[PDB]
């Protein structure tokens, strides 16, 4: 049961540096190699580098000049530092565990979740959550839809969960749309039995990590 999780600012002024920290639970960072990998937009994966507390590291030659990777045995922290970030360096970043040798060689079974680093001079702006009430009047057979619109947010990473993880079936959390303002807007929708509208309530937990906003809003007819 090894767990990897990344922490990242979301925004890095261009021509400056990128600092990322992958915290590891369930393994001593002293006794494993660790990997940083990059994924811009929907494009392919790019392996950034490898490091080991007691072993010389190897970094991808495209990024070598800018990459430095360190380890903090006290807090089990795997670090990534990208000097002189360009616009191209805007990407999702993943940390992973380089397993010990097997008769299958070096394998990576354990991955992080990924943090999206955008590279902009723009300013962190928090979302605005507004409900999408159900038109109970609509016959719509026996089904009815609920929503939580999330508008005017500038760091793209935005997470939406319904009823604190209790609602998972029927949820369609749409992809971001970049508006003319330069700000993003998500819609999250849930199809529901029309019957359960009266007795059960419906809530949205929306957590814009870069702005540290966590607006939870109710959807009442």
């Amino acid at each position: 049961q090894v767990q990897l999780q990344e922490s990242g600012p979301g925004l890095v002024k261009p021509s400056e540096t990128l600092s990322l920290t992958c915290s590891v639970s369930g393994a001593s960072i002293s006794s494993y190699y660790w990997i940083w990998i990059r994924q811009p937009a929907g494009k392919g994966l790019e392996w950034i580098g490898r490091f080991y507390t007691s072993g010389s590291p190897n970094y991808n030659p495209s990024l070598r000049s800018r990459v430095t990777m360190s380890v903090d045995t006290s807090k089990n922290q795997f670090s990534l530092k990208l000097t002189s970030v360009t616009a191209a360096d805007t990407a999702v970043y993943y940390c992973a565990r380089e397993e010990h040798i097997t008769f299958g060689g070096v394998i990576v079974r354990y991955w992080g979740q990924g943090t999206l680093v955008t590279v902009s001079s723009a300013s962190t702006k928090g979302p605005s959550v507004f409900p999408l009430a159900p038109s109970s009047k609509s016959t719509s057979g026996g089904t009815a839809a609920l929503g939580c619109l999330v508008k005017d947010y500038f760091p793209e990473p935005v997470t939406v969960s319904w009823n604190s993880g209790a609602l998972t079936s029927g949820v369609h959390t749409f992809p971001a749309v970049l508006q003319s303002s330069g700000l993003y807007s998500l819609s999250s929708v849930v199809t529901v039995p029309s019957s359960s509208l009266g007795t059960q309530t419906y809530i949205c937990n929306v957590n814009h990590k870069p702005s540290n906003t966590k607006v939870d809003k109710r959807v009442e007819p």
Partner: protein, 212 residues
């Protein structure tokens, strides 16, 4: 240093078909290739190592073959949860490299959407803007057209659509068409309507609300 070229970077097959994805290499990798399944918005999940060794917990239907310069990932009975981008990797020599990935999608029975309209939120209205939303839910032919009629006045501008990726269970899609207007907020107009046009519908389905 060593490139990894995959094929075809776009597939589509109904459930049960065999699928096979080829991955070629600038140099010989002997058997140091690995295959990954990246689902929508998730980390890659390692499918195959040593170019043939299935990792534990991967279904019997995945199978990797090849040595040297050409390699093949094969799915025996493509299932709905297999919708994903599939990648390929050299752990032969550094720097490590990946393929461009191939997106395996799923052909399905045609599904008619279910349409919903959402009027703008009063709180937003107080802020000084307004948004109406058409929700098209669970349709297979991703291709559909949604029109915005404002008292029978089509208005292409002030509208943005976004699409879900394929569901793992249904392999269906959903659309959100967001009409964003605030000229007199949405005053000067009594009715709003979505004209939704799709193959699963004999004649276009409009839905409409006249609140404001």
């Amino acid at each position: 240093d060593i490139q990894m070229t995959q094929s075809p970077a776009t597939l589509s097959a109904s459930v049960g078909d065999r699928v096979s994805i080829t991955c070629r290499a600038s140099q010989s990798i002997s058997s140091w290739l690995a295959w990954y399944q990246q689902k929508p918005g998730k980390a890659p999940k390692l499918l195959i190592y040593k170019a043939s060794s299935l990792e534990s917990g991967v279904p019997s239907r995945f199978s990797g073959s090849g040595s040297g310069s050409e390699f093949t990932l094969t799915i025996s009975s493509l299932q709905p949860d297999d919708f994903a981008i599939y990648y390929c990797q050299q752990y032969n020599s550094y720097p490590w490299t990946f393929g461009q990935g191939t997106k395996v999608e799923i052909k399905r029975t045609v599904a008619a959407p279910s349409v919903f309209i959402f009027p703008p939120s009063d709180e937003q209205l107080k802020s000084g803007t307004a948004s109406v939303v058409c929700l098209l839910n669970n349709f297979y032919p991703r291709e559909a057209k949604v029109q915005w009629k404002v008292d029978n006045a089509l208005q292409s501008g002030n509208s943005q659509e976004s699409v879900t990726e394929q569901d793992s269970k249904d392999s269906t899609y959903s659309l959100s068409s967001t009409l964003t207007l605030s000229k007199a907020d949405y005053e000067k107009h009594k009715v709003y309507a979505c004209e939704v046009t799709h193959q699963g519908l004999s004649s276009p389905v409009t839905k409409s609300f006249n609140r404001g």
